[PDB]
From a paper:
One structure, solved to 2.0 Å, showed a previously unobserved conformation. Overall, the quaternary structure is similar to previous PfA-M17 structures with the hexamer arranged as a dimer of trimers and the domain arrangement in each unit consistent with previous conformations. However, the new structure shows a vastly different active-site arrangement to any previously published M17 structure. In the new conformation, L13 loops of each of the six chains cross the entrance to the active sites and extend to the active site of the neighboring chain in the trimer. A relatively large movement of approximately 13 Å is required to elicit the conformational changes in each of the six loops, which also serves to occlude the entrances to the six sites. To obtain the slack within L13 to adopt this extended occluded conformation, the secondary structure at both ends of the loop has been disrupted. The interesting finding is that the “catalytic” metal in site 2 is absent and further, there is electron density indicative of a metal ion observed in a third, previously uncharacterized site. This position, which we now refer to as site 3, is 3.8 Å from site 1 and coordinated by the side chains of Asp394 and Asp399, the main chain oxygen of Met396, and two ordered water molecules.
Although overall sequence conservation is low, M17 aminopeptidases possess a conserved homohexameric structure wherein a dimer of trimers encloses an inner cavity harboring the six active sites. PfA-M17 is essential for the blood stage of the parasite life cycle, and inhibition of PfA-M17 results in parasite death both in vitro and in vivo. The crystal structure of both PfA-M17 and Pv-M17 shows the homohexameric arrangement characteristic of M17 aminopeptidase enzymes, with the six active sites orientated inward and accessible to the central cavity.
Residue numbers in the entry:
A (entry chain B): 86 to 603
B (entry chain C): 86 to 389, 391 to 610
C (entry chain E): 88 to 91, 94 to 257, 262 to 387, 391 to 609
D (entry chain F): 138 to 190
Write the structure that this text describes.
C-alpha cells in the first residue's frame, strides 16, 4: 500500500534493521572446569561474596596463564570489594609477554541474584564495553546462575548494548565499535549453550518492538506499519492479511473506524497468523493497541478533572505483538495456532474527525456513546476483540498502553493484568516469571460497571466520575468478549524507559513465553 | 440536500419519532362532583393538607365502590403523610371482584404548588408508571390547580413518561409498557378538557426539541438538521426556505460564514414561516442558535479567559423548531411567525477561521474575532440582521450563549435581555403561563466601551469584563437597528443534568408568546 | 481539653434503636405467615436478565396468596435493586404491606450486590411507619453473607442525629425466612456486634473537628476501654519525648491540642497463643501544614478513619471476647496545624528508632505518625502488626472507592488479611511493595526521605517508607484512602472494623473447634 | 573531535610508560568527561592505578 504524503520529503516506510551488530557477535560458551584463557580483548569476572556486605573479591576460577594468575592472587585482589555495580580494570602481561586487559564486576552479597540486580550488573558491563575499542569480551561466571538467569543476562546485554542510529545523520557516534566475539566461562557449559541463540532471538524481538516504538510519527503510520508487518510475515513464512477501510465497513467496525475518521492515512487492520504443521491443540489471539499518533482528537474543552493522557507511546502493544510474531515465527513452536492482531489507526484533529457525544456502533452491534475522543485506545480495542473472538480461539490476550493511572497503581516497573478467567491470568503471571517481565494481577471490580450505563446508547465509552481508569477501561473491554477466556495487560507505565529515553520493548518475551509454555 | 460522509457507516439523517406512545393514550376528564369510579389499572389521588406540614392523608373525593371506599377510610390512611413527592400503592378487590391498584402522591402543605413542586409530583407519578404493566392510569385531583397548571401537569407527565430509545441497539428495555388510557377527575372538569390536546401538542413540541438536542453530532449536522426542518414544514404545510452557502455569500453573512468555514458540512440557514389566513396583526421572528457541534475552533492557546463547558449548542434552534410544531399544529390567528436558525459547525481544520480575524457582518459592521469559541454570538449577529430585514414587530432569539448564566440564575431560570420593556414584559408573562421560569436581566450600557476595537468596528468579545452574559447581549444589540428585540440565554437551563437528558426548554415559552395576543384578546 | 462555647467531648450513642429490634429466623420450608408489618421477598431470575418476578413460597393467607400469584407478579421484574411494595388487607382485615426486592439474574450475589438490595430495603423502611419487617430469602446466601446482610441493614438503617437540634419510627421486630434457618441463628447477634463496631467508627469519623481532637478522642477511647474492661494507657507528650517519637511529635508541634498516643489492650483469660498490634492513623484534623507553595495532592479529610476502625474493632473484640489472643489497639493521635510552632518542609527529624527523616512535604503527615507508631508496636513483641490508614490519594486511581489495598512484608500475614476480607465481605486487594522504587527515598542529607520527589506510585512509595520502621516482624499495611467515605450517601462507611475483627478471630475460624 | 588519547608527558617508570603507549591509548577518546583507569604494578612491583580524563 502506498503511503500518502503532504510534502515530497515525507518518508513512506519505517526503516528497520534486521541484521544488527549484535547478530555479528560470535558467542562461545566454555566450561569453567577447563580453566580460563585470556589473550586479546577484555576478560571480566562476575564475582560476589555472600553474607559479608562489601566483602572482598576473590578469583576462584582457574586461569590458564601463570602471569595473569599471579596478578589475580588473593593478596592482590583483597583490596577490592564486591559492591553491586562496582567495576575495576587491570592491565598486565600474559605468558606470551603480550598486554591483556582484565577486570571484574561486583555482584553484591546475595548468592542468587535477582533480575533487577543482574540488570544492574549488565549495565556496568555495558559501561566497560562503551568508549573502549575492544574486539572480544570474555565473561567468567564465578556466581551461581541458572539457565533462565543466563538467558536474561544475554538478552539484557544484547538489548542495552545495541544503539539505535537509524535517524542520526550528522551525529553518528564516530567512536562506537562493537565486539566481534563474546566468550562465556560457566560451569556445565553444555547446559547453557541452548540458551544463547534463544536469547539472541528474544533480544531482537524486543529490539524489533523498540525500533517500531522509537519510529517517529512522520515515518510510522497505519500504512507504513502494516507494510512492515507484511514484510515481517514474508520473512518468516507467516500468513498475513491487511484489512482496508472497505472490508472494515463490511465488518461494521464502527468504533475503530470512528477513531481513524479524521486521519490522512486510512485504517489498516493487521492480521498475522502462525500455524503449527501438526495437530493444533491451542488457539491464541494476541491483540495489540496500535495508534501510530494520538492527538487526542476533539477533546479541546475538557471539564477540569477530566482524564488526562500524557503517555505518547500508543502503539507499544502492537509493537510487542509483532515482536512476539518474530520470536514465534523464528522458534516455530508445536501444536499451536497464533493470531497476531492490531487495529492500527491515527487519532487526528480535522474536519472529518469524530466528536465527543457521537454514538457509534461496534462490530458486535453494541452502540457506544463517545465521552472523550482522547480515550481512543479502548474504542479500537473493542472492535479488535470482537474480531479476535470471531476467530474461535481458546485465549484472547490484549496488550496496550491504555491508562495513565497505571503510573499511580504499579508505577514504571510492573505491568498490570486484568481478565475474565483465572486460569488464563495465572498463565500470564507464570509467563511473567519466566520472561522476567514483571506483571501484577489487578481486579475487574464489577461495582463500577454501572458508571458505564449510557442514557441513550447501549454503553458509555468512559466514566464521568470514577477515577479508577484502568479498571473502568477493563470493564468496557469486557463488554466485547462473550465467551472466551480473555486477559488485558495494561503496559502504560512500563512501555518507555524514561531514564534511558528509549523503549523497553516490554511484552515481547512475556507473550512469547506464554505462547511457548502453553 | 445530501449529507456528506467520511466513511460509508456515517448516518445521513436524524431519526425522529413522530408517532409516540403518548399519542396513543386516550384521555378522559370527568367531574369530581360525581365521584370517582375504580374498575381497573392504577388510580392515584393527588392529596395535600394545607398548613399542617406532613399532615395525615385524608381522601376528600367520593368513590363509587364500597371496597375501595373504606380501604381509603381515615383510620387506614393515618399512617401516611403528605410530604411532597411521597407515594404509596394499595392492592385490593373492588365491588366487581376485580383487582385494582390505588394510591396517592403527597402534594405538601402549601395550597399553591410551584412549577418545581408540580414537577416533583409528576416524577413520583411516573415512578409508579415505570416498572409496572398498567393498561390505564386515573388521577384524582384533591388539590387546586388552574388551567395553565393542569396543562403543565399533563405536559410534564407526557414528557417524563416518554423514553428516547432511538440509539439503543442491544440494551432496549424489554419491560417497557405504556398505558393506553388516562382518566382525570377534577372539579369543574369541563373547563379543563380544552387543555388536554393543547398539552399533548405542547408535549411533542418539547419532545421534538429533546430529540434534536439528544441527537449525536454524527447524526445531527447542518445538512441533516435543515432536512428535518423541511420535513417538519412539509408535514404542517408551513412555508420553508433553506439558504445555502452561495446565497449566504450574496447576503454577506460574513460572521455566520466564518464560524462554519472549517466544517465538513456546509452552512444551512433555516427559514420556516407560519402565516395565518385572516388578518396578519403581528409579525414575529424567532431566532435559535444552531451549532450542531462546537469544538471551540482555534482557541488552543487561551490566556489563563472565558471557558465554555456547555455542549448543547443547538438547543435554541431546537426550541424554535419545536415552537414551529406547536404553532403549525394549533394554527393561531392574526399572526405571521418566522422560525430562523443559522445552522453550522465550529470545527478545527486548515480552513477554519482564527482569533484575530476581522470579518464583515451582513449589516456592514466589521468584527475583530477575539475567541473562536465565542461562535454563538457571531452566528446570531447575521441571523438578527436577517430577521430585522423581514420587517417584523418582535425579534426574539434563544441561545445557550454564556456559561455565566450558571453563576447568575443557575439551572432553573433562564435570563432574558432586551431593548424594549414592552417585549420583555410579554416574555415574562409567557414564562408565567408556560411555567418555564425566566428572569429579566439588564443590558448595562457602561460595559459597551469594552467592545471598542482598535482596528475593526467592534470587538467580538471583551478581554476583561467577566459579566459575559451582559457583554454578549451588548454585542447582539449592535445587530438590531430599530426593532423591539429580546434575547433569552438558556445556557444554564437547557439540560437536565440529574436525568442526563434535555429539557426542551423554550418550546412552550415561545408558543405562549406567539399566543400572547389571543391570550390578551377580548375573545379569551 | 483546651478551648479557643467550644465543646470538650465527643458525643457517642451506645444504645441505638437497632439494639431494640427483636430478630427471629424461621425456616422457609414451613411457609411464611403474613399478619402485620411489611413482608419483602428477595427474588431473582437466573434465566432472563430483568426477568419477571415469581414467588415460590407459600403464604398462609388467601388474599396475600392471590396477590403473589404468578399471573399477578409478572408485571414486575427482578432488576437488581428494583422493588415494589403494596398495602392491602389480609384474611383478618388487617393492613399489611407485601412486596419484593429484585436480586438480579446472577445466583451468587457479591457484597456490592447485597448492598444494593439492602439499600432498597432501607428506602422502604425510611418511608413506611412499620412495627415489623419480614424478609423472605428466595435466594441463596451463605452464613457470612447473611450476617453481612444484617450488619449492612442495621448500619444503613441507623441515622446519626447527634448534631441537629432543630432538624430532628424504627421497627421493633425483624423476621427472616430462610432455608436451613437453624444454621443462621448464630449470625444474628454477631451481626449486631459487628454493626455497632462499624457504627461506632462512623460516629468517630463523622464527629466534627471542633468536637474531635487528640484529647477528646483519647478520652473516648478510655471510656470504651472502661466499658469493656480493657486495659488502657494514654501516652502524653513527656512520655513521647522520652521514647523519642520525633516524627510523630513533629506533626503535632503546631497544634493547640497536644499529642495523645492511644494504647488499648484486650487479653484472653486462658493461654495467649497470638499477639497482634493494630495501628490506626489518627489525624483528627489535617490542615496540610506548611505546604503553602506546592506535586502530590492531598485533598481528602477523613484522616482518623484508621483509628476509628481500630477502636471499632476494639468494641467487637471486647464484646465477643475471643480466646487465645492478646490484641493491642494503637493510634498516634495528633493534629497537623499551621502556626509559628509548626514543623516545616526541609526539617530533618529523628524517629524513635534513630533513623533521620528529611521532611519534603508537611502534608504527608500520615506516614510520619505511623512510623513512630510502628516502632512502638514492634517493641511490644507481637506476632503480627497491621496498620490501617487513609494514606495515599493514589488509591482512588488504582483500586477506586470499593476495594482497599493491602501491602506487607509477609505473605502469610497478607493471605490472612485476604481471608478476613472474604469472611467480613469488606473487599481488599493485594498490591506489591516494589523494591526498585526504594532508591527514590535516599535522602542526600538524612537517612531517608519522607517522600519521593518524582515517583507517582505514591501508595507503593509510602509502603516502602513504612517498611523502614518494622525491623523483624510480620507486618501488613491497609490503605483505605479510597474506601473510607461513602461519597454518594455523604457519610462514613466504617470500613475495616469487621475486616480487622475477622482477622483477630482468624485462629478461631481456623481452629478444630 | 572525540579523537584518540595521546599522552605527551614522560613518566619515570618503564612499566607504566609501556601502558601509556600510543597503541594502547588510541582505544580511548577524549570526549569531555570520559575516563578510564587501570590497575597495574610499577617498576618497584607496587600497585598503581593510572588513567585519563
Ligand atoms: Ca547490518
Ligand atoms: Ca499501545
Ligand atoms: Ca385539598
Ligand atoms: Ca443553543
Ligand atoms: Ca453603536
Ligand atoms: Ca388585546
Ligand atoms: Ca391470618
Ligand atoms: Ca460457628
Ligand atoms: Ca486514617
Ligand atoms: Zn496516549
Ligand atoms: Zn488517548
Ligand atoms: Zn458551547
Ligand atoms: Zn463556544
Ligand atoms: Zn488527608
Ligand atoms: Zn495530608
Amino acid at each position: 500500500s502506498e503511503v500518502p504524503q503532504v510534502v515530497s520529503l515525507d518518508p513512506t516506510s519505517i526503516p528497520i534493521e534486521y541484521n544488527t551488530p549484535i547478530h555479528d557477535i560470535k558467542v562461545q560458551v566454555y566450561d569453567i572446569k577447563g580453566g580460563c584463557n585470556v589473550e586479546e580483548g577484555l576478560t571480566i569476572f562476575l564475582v560476589n561474596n555472600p553474607g559479608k556486605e562489601n566483602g572482598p573479591v576473590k578469583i576462584s576460577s582457574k586461569v590458564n596463564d601463570k602471569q595473569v594468575s599471579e596478578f589475580l592472587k588473593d593478596e592482590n585482589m583483597e583490596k577490592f570489594n564486591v559492591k553491586l555495580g562496582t567495576s575495576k580494570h587491570f592491565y598486565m602481561f600474559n605468558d606470551n609477554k603480550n598486554s591483556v586487559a582484565v577486570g571484574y564486576v561486583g555482584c553484591g552479597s546475595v548468592a542468587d541474584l535477582s533480575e533487577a540486580d543482574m540488570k544492574r550488573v549488565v549495565l556496568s558491563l555495558v559501561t566497560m564495553l562503551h568508549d573502549n575499542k575492544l574486539s572480544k569480551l570474555t565473561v567468567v561466571f564465578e556466581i551461581n546462575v541458572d539457565k533462565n538467569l543466563f538467558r536474561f543476562f544475554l538478552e539484557t546485554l544484547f538489548y542495552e548494548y545495541m544503539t539505535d542510529e537509524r535517524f542520526k545523520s550528522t551525529d553518528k557516534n564516530v567512536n562506537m565499535e562493537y565486539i566481534k566475539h563474546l566468550g562465556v566461562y560457566i560451569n556445565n557449559a553444555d547446559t547453557y549453550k541452548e540458551e544463547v541463540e534463544k536469547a539472541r532471538v528474544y533480544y531482537f524481538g524486543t529490539y524489533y518492538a523498540s525500533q517500531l516504538i522509537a519510529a517517529p510519527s512522520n515515518y510510522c503510520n497505519p500504512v507504513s506499519l502494516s507494510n512492515a508487518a507484511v514484510e515481517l510475515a514474508q520473512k518468516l513464512n507467516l500468513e498475513y492479511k491487511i484489512l482496508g477501510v472497505k472490508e472494515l465497513e463490511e465488518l461494521k467496525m464502527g468504533a475503530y473506524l470512528s477513531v481513524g475518521k479524521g486521519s490522512m492515512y486510512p485504517n489498516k487492520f493487521i492480521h498475522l497468523t502462525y500455524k503449527s504443521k501438526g495437530d493444533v491443540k491451542k488457539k491464541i489471539a494476541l491483540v495489540g493497541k496500535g495508534i501510530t499518533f494520538d492527538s487526542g482528537g476533539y477533546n479541546l474543552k475538557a471539564a477540569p478533572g477530566s482524564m488526562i493522557d500524557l503517555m505518547k507511546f500508543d502503539m507499544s502493544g502492537c509493537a510487542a505483538v509483532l515482536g512476539c510474531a518474530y520470536c514465534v515465527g523464528t522458534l516455530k513452536p508445536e501444536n499451536v495456532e497464533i493470531h497476531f492482531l492490531s487495529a492500527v489507526c491515527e487519532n487526528m484533529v480535522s474536519k472529518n474527525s469524530y466528536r465527543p457525544g457521537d454514538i457509534i456502533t461496534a462490530s458486535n452491534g453494541k452502540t457506544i456513546e463517545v465521552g472523550n475522543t482522547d480515550a481512543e485506545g479502548r474504542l479500537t480495542l473493542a472492535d479488535a476483540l470482537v474480531y479476535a473472538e470471531k476467530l474461535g480461539v481458546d485465549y484472547i490476550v490484549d496488550i496496550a498502553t491504555l491508562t495513565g493511572a497505571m503510573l499511580y497503581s504499579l508505577g514504571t516497573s510492573y505491568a498490570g493484568v486484568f481478565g475474565n478467567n483465572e486460569e488464563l491470568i495465572n498463565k500470564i503471571l507464570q509467563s511473567s516469571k519466566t520472561s522476567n517481565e514483571p506483571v501484577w494481577w489487578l481486579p475487574i471490580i464489577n461495582e463500577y460497571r454501572a458508571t458505564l450505563n449510557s442514557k441513550y446508547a447501549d454503553i458509555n465509552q468512559i466514566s464521568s466520575s470514577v477515577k479508577a481508569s484502568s479498571i473502568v477501561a477493563s470493564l468496557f473491554l469486557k463488554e466485547f468478549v462473550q465467551n472466551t477466556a480473555w486477559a488485558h495487560i495494561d503496559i502504560a507505565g512500563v512501555s518507555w524507559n524514561f531514564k534511558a529515553r528509549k523503549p523497553k520493548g516490554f511484552g515481547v518475551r512475556l507473550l512469547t513465553e506464554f505462547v511457548l509454555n502453553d
